[PDB]
PDB file of C-alpha atoms and ligand atoms in Angstrom:
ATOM      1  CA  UNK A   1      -4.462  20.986  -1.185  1.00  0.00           C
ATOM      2  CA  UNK A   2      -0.624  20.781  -2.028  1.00  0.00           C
ATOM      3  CA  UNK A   3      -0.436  21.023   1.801  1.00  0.00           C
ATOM      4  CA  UNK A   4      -2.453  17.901   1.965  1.00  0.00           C
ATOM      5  CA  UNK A   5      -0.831  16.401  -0.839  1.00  0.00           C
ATOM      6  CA  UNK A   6       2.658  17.142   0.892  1.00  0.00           C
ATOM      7  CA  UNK A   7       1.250  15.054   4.126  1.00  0.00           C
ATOM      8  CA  UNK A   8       0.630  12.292   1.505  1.00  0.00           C
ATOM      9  CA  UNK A   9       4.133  12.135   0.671  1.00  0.00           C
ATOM     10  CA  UNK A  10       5.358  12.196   3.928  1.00  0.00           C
ATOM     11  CA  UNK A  11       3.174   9.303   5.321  1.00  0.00           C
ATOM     12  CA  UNK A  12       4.477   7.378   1.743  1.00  0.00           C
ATOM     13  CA  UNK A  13       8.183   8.155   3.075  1.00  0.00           C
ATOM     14  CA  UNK A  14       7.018   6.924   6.558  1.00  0.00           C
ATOM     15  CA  UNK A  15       5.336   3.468   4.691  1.00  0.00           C
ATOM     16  CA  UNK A  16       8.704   3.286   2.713  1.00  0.00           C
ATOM     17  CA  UNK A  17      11.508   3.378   5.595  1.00  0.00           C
ATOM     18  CA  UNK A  18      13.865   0.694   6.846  1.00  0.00           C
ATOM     19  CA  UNK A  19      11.854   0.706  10.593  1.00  0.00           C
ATOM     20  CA  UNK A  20       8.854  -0.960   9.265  1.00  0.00           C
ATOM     21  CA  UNK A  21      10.864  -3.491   6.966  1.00  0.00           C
ATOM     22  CA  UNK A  22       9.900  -6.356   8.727  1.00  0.00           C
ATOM     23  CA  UNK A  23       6.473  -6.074   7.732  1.00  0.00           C
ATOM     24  CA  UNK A  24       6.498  -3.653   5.136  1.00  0.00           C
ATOM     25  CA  UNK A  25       8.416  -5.822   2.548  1.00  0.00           C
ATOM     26  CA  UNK A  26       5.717  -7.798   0.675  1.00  0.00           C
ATOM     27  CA  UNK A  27       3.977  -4.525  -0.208  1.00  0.00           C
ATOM     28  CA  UNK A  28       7.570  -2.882  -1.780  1.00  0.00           C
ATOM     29  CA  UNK A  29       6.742  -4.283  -5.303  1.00  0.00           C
ATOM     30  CA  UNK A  30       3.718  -5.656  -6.967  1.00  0.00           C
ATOM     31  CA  UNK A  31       2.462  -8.791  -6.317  1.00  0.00           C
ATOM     32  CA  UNK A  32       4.234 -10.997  -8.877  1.00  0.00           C
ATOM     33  CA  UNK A  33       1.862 -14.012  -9.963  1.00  0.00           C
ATOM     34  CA  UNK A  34       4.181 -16.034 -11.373  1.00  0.00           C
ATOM     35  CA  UNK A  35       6.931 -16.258  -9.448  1.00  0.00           C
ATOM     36  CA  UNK A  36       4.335 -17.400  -5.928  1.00  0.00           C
ATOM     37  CA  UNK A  37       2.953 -19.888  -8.185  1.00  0.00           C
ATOM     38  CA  UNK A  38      -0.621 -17.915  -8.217  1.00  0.00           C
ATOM     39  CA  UNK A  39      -2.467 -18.617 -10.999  1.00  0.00           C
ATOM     40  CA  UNK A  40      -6.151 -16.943  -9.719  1.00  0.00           C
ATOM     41  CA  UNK A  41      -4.483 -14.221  -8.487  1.00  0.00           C
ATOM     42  CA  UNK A  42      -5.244 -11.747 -11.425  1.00  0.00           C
ATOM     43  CA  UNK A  43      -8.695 -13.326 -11.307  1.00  0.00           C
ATOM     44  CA  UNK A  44      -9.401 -12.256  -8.386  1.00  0.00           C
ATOM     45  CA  UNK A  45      -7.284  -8.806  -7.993  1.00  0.00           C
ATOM     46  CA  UNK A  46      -8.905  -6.666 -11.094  1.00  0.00           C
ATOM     47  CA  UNK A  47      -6.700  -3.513  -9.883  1.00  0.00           C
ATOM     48  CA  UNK A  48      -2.962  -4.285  -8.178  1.00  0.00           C
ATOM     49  CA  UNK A  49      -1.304  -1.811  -5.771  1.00  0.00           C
ATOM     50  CA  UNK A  50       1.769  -1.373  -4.427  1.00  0.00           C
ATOM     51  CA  UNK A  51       3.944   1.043  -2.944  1.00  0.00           C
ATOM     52  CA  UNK A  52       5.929   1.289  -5.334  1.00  0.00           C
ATOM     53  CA  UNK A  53       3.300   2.035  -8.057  1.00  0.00           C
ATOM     54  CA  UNK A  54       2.458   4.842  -5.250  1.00  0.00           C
ATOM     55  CA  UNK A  55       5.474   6.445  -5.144  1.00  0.00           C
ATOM     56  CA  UNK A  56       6.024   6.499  -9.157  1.00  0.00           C
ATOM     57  CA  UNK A  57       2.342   8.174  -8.846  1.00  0.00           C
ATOM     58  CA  UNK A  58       3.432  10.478  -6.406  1.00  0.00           C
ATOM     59  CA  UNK A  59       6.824  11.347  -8.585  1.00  0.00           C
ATOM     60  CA  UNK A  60       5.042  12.115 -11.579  1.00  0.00           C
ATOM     61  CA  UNK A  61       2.239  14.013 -10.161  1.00  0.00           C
ATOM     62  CA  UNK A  62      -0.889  11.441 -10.474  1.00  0.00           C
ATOM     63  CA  UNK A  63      -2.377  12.590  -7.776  1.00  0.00           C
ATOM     64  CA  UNK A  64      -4.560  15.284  -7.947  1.00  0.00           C
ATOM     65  CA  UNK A  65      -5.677  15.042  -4.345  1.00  0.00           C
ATOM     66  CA  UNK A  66      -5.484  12.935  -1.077  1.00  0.00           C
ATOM     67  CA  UNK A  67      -8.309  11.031  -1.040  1.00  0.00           C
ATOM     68  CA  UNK A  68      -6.924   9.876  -4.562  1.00  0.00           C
ATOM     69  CA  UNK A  69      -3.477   8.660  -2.725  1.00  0.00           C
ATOM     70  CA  UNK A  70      -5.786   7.002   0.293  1.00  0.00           C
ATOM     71  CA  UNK A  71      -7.599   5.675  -2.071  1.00  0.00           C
ATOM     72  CA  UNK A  72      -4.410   3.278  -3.133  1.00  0.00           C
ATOM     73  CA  UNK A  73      -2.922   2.917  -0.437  1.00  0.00           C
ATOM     74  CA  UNK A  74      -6.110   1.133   0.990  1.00  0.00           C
ATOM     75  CA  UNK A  75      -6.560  -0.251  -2.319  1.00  0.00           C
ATOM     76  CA  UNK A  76      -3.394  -2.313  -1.571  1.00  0.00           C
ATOM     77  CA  UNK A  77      -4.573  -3.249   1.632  1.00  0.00           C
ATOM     78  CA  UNK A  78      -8.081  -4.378   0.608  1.00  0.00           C
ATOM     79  CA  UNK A  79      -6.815  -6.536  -2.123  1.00  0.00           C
ATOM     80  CA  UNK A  80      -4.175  -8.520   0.333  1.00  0.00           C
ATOM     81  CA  UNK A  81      -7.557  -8.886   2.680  1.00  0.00           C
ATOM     82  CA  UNK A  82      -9.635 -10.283   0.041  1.00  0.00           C
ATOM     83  CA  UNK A  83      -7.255 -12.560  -2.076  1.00  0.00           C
ATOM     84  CA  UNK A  84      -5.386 -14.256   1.138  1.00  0.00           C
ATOM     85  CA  UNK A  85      -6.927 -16.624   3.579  1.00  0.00           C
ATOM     86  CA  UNK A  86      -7.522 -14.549   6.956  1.00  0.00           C
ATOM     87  CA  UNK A  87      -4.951 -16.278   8.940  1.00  0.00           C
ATOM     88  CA  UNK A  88      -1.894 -15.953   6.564  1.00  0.00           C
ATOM     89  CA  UNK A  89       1.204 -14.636   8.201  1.00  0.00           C
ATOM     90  CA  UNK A  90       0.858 -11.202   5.183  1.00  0.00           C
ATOM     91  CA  UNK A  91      -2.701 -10.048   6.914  1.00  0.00           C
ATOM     92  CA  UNK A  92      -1.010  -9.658   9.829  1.00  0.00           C
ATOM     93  CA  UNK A  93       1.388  -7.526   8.171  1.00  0.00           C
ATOM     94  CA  UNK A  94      -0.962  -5.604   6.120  1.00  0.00           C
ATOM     95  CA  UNK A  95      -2.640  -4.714   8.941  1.00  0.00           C
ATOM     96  CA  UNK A  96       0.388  -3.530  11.170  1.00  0.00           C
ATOM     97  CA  UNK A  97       1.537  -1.524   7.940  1.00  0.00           C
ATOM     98  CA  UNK A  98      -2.295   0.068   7.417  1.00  0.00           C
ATOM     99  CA  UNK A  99      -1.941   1.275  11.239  1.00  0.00           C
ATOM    100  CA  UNK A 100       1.305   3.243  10.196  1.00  0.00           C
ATOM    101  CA  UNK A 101      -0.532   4.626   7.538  1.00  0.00           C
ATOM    102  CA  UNK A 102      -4.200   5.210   8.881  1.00  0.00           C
ATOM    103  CA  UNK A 103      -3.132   6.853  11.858  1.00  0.00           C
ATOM    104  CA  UNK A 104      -1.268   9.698   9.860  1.00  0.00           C
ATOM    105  CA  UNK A 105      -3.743  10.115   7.359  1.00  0.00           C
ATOM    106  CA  UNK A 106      -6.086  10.444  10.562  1.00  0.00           C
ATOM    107  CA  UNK A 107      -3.479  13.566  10.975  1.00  0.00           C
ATOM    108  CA  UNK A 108      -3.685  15.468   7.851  1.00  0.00           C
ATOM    109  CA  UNK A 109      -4.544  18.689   8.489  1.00  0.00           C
TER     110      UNK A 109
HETATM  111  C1  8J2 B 201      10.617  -6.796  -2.272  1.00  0.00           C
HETATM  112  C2  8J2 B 201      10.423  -8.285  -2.338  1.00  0.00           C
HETATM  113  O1  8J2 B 201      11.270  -9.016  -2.835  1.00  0.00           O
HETATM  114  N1  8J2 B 201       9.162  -8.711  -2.029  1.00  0.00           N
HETATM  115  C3  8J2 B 201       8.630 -10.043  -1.902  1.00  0.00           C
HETATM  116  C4  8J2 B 201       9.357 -11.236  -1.961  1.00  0.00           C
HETATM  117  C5  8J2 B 201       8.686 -12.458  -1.908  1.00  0.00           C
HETATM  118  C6  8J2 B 201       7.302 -12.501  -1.780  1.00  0.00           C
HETATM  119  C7  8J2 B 201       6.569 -11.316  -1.681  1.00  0.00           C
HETATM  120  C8  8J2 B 201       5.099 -11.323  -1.547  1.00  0.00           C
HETATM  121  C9  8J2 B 201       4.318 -10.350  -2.161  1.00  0.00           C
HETATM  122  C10 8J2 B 201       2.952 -10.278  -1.944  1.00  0.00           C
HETATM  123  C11 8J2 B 201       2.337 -11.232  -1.135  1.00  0.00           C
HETATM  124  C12 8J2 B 201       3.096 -12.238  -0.528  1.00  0.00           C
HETATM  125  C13 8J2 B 201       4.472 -12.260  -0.726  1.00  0.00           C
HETATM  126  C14 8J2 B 201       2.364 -13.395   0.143  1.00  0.00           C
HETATM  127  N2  8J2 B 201       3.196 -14.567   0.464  1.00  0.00           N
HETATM  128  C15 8J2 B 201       3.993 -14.641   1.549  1.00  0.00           C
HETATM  129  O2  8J2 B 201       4.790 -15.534   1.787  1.00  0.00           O
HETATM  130  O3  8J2 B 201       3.799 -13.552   2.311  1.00  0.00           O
HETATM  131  C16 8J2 B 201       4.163 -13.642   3.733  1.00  0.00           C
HETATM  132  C17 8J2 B 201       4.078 -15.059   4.327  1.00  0.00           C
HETATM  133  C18 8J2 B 201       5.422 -13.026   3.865  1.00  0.00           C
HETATM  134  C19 8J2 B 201       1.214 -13.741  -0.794  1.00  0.00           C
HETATM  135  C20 8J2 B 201       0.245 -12.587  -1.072  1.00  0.00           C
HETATM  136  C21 8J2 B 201      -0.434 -12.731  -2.426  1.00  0.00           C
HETATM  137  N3  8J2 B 201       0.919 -11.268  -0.944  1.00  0.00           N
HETATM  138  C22 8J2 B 201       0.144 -10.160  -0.645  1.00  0.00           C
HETATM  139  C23 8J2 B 201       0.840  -8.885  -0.250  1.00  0.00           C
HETATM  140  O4  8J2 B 201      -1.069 -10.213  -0.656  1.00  0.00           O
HETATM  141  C24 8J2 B 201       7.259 -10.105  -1.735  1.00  0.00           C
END
């Protein structure tokens, strides 16, 4: 639906805003191997996501359909589950950020 499709881009606004900064921030930009020193990190993560590869999806139009956009977001979520052990301080992020975003998607209409 572009109805559906507009929810989408409301919940990536939401995902995006300054009020969930503190635990929103390692999921602004992709996941940059290098720079955190992690060598198996491509190894392991055969498809990257962030929200910022979202929204340039979103801008252009990728998306032909909702499930498509839930499908990255969780995507992004999923891949900071299974690379990181459980008890790192970014699960606990990921999974206050997912809430944000499951329980809207839970809303579309
Ligand atoms: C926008 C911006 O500059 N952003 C930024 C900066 C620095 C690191 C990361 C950044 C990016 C991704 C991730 C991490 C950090 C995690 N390491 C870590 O200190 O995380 C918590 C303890 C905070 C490692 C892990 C591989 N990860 C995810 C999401 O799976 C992101």
């Amino acid at each position: 639906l572009s109805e559906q499709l507009k929810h989408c881009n409301g919940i990536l606004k939401e995902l995006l805003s300054k009020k969930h900064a503190a635990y929103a921030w390692p999921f602004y930009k992709p996941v940059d191997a290098s720079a955190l020193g992690l060598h198996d990190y491509h190894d392991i993560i055969k498809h990257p996501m962030d929200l910022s590869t979202v929204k340039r999806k979103m801008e252009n139009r990728d998306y032909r359909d909702a499930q498509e956009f839930a499908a990255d977001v969780r995507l992004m979520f999923s891949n900071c589950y299974k690379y990181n052990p459980p008890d790192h301080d970014v699960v606990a992020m990921a999974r206050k950020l997912q809430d944000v975003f499951e329980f809207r998607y839970a809303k579309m209409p």
